[PDB]
Amino acid sequence: METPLLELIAIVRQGSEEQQKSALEQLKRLLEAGADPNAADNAGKTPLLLLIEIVRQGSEEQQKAALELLKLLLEAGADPNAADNAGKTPLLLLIEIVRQGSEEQQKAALELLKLLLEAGADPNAADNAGKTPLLLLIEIVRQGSEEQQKAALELLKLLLEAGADPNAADNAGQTPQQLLKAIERQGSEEQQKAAKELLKLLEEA
Numbered sequence: 001m002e003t004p005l006l007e008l009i010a011i012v013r014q015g016s017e018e019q020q021k022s023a024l025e026q027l028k029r030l031l032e033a034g035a036d037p038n039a040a041d042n043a044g045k046t047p048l049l050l051l052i053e054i055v056r057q058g059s060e061e062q063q064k065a066a067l068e069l070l071k072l073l074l075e076a077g078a079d080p081n082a083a084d085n086a087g088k089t090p091l092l093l094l095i096e097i098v099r100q101g102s103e104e105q106q107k108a109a110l111e112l113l114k115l116l117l118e119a120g121a122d123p124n125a126a127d128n129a130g131k132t133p134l135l136l137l138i139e140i141v142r143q144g145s146e147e148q149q150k151a152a153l154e155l156l157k158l159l160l161e162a163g164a165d166p167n168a169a170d171n172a173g174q175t176p177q178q179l180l181k182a183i184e185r186q187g188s189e190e191q192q193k194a195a196k197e198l199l200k201l202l203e204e205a
Helices: 002-014 015-031 047-057 058-076 090-100 103-118 133-143 146-159 174-188 188-205
Strands: none
Touching: 002 015, 002 047, 002 146, 015 058, 015 090, 047 058, 047 090, 047 103, 058 103, 090 133, 090 188, 103 146, 103 174, 133 146, 133 188, 146 188, 174 188
């Protein structure tokens, strides 16, 4: 399962700044010439997932290079829903970046998540514990910084307008409405006013 796309993404991940730039230009030319955007490495990691790992771990230059390449992969037809072997999906992984990333990483991930949803990512596809994107993003409202709270608010609205199940519960029974009311009880005045707006948005959906 070795291809030019995967070898070159490896150079974006590990090469010098000059090597990264040349690898990005070679990747675009391969994609433009029809290289398969879906052919995965020996671990079931897709080009999309591998470049999202670069957004999660890379320098500010690497995050920009990977954001550019991720947009081109999605325009090339990369499957926005394909998971790796451990069950990680691009939507879930990008939500992890919102939860743990720097302010620069959060912005990249917010831009990518919108592109992912426009490409057909499943807004209902959950992780192992059964947490939906909806639940995971409400957890960021609860525990994030003010800037994470704001991005999560934006993503939640875009996720409901993309058809997310307002009532879908996780494996333990937890619901978005349950979590939002806990934020209403325990959160800051800013969080309480956000959780109230989100409860009305949940019902309306």
